[PDB]
Amino acid sequence: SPYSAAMAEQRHQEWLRFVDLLKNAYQNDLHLPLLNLMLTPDEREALGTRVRIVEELLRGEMSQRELKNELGAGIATITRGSNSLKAAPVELRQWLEEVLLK
Amino acid sequence: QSPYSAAMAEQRHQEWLRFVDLLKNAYQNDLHLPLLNLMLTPDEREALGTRVRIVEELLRGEMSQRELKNELGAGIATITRGSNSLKAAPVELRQWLEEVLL
Ligand SMILES: O=C(O)CCc1c[nH]c2ccccc12
Numbered sequence: 001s002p003y004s005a006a007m008a009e010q011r012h013q014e015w016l017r018f019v020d021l022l023k024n025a026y027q028n029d030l031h032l033p034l035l036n037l038m039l040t041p042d043e044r045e046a047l048g049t050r051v052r053i054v055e056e057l058l059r060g061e062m063s064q065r066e067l068k069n070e071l072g073a074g075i076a077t078i079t080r081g082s083n084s085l086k087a088a089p090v091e092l093r094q095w096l097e098e099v100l101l102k
Numbered sequence: 103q104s105p106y107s108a109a110m111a112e113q114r115h116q117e118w119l120r121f122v123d124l125l126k127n128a129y130q131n132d133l134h135l136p137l138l139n140l141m142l143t144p145d146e147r148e149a150l151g152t153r154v155r156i157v158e159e160l161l162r163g164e165m166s167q168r169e170l171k172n173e174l175g176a177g178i179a180t181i182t183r184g185s186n187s188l189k190a191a192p193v194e195l196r197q198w199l200e201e202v203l204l
């Protein structure tokens with residue numbers, strides 16, 4: 001079954017292999033061509049927009065509807081971003097607030 | 103406001119490079135795994151794990167179309183797009199991938 005625990009374990013090891021591959025691509029200065037190979041153009045654009053969503057949610061000045069109109073993202077996308085930021089570990093959120101809100 | 107413009111193409115490039123730099127620092131701070139969990143949906147993370155195996159098998163050249171669809175669940179359209187991306191990749195990236203993946 002595709003929802004089995006053994007399949008979730010295979011997906012996890014495949015994901016960690018990508019993370020390690022990307023880790024060493026940065027060390028070899030090959031991260032830009034590898035990300036161009038592994039991601040579609042729309043996936044790269046979404047990642048850039050999601051950084052802005054994280055920044056504005058952390059800042060708390062703009063409303064979610066306001067966020068939707070400046071970036072062209074739906075309300076559902078904004079809400080899923082807020083869900084993900086809420087579930088993020090404290091150590092990550094603390095670092096993001098120092099980087100994106102300086 | 104229209105996404106098809108030289109001004110918006112420049113904005114998309116800066117937003118992408120900002121995520122690239124953010125992820126580079128996360129690797130150096132060992133926050134890459136929670137950052138990637140924050141910025142990607144689980145189905146996107148699963149696809150990236152699968153695309154590594156597609157690249158591996160395309161470079162190896164042994165798996166056939168039925169095997170690629172049976173083992174990786176990748177249809178003909180996905181393999182074709184992955185092949186297109188690999189053909190566009192610079193040699194230096196392809197040299198390195200054949201070393202670390204095989
Ligand atoms: O639209 C989606 O499905 C992606 C939602 C999403 C996941 N992580 C995110 C981080 C910031 C902004 C949005 C998101």
Ligand SMILES: O=C(O)CCc1c[nH]c2ccccc12
Nearest residue numbers: 037038153156180183184187
């Ligand atoms: O649309 C898709 O299915 C993703 C296509 C795609 C981009 N880079 C890839 C690398 C390996 C395999 C597939 C891909």
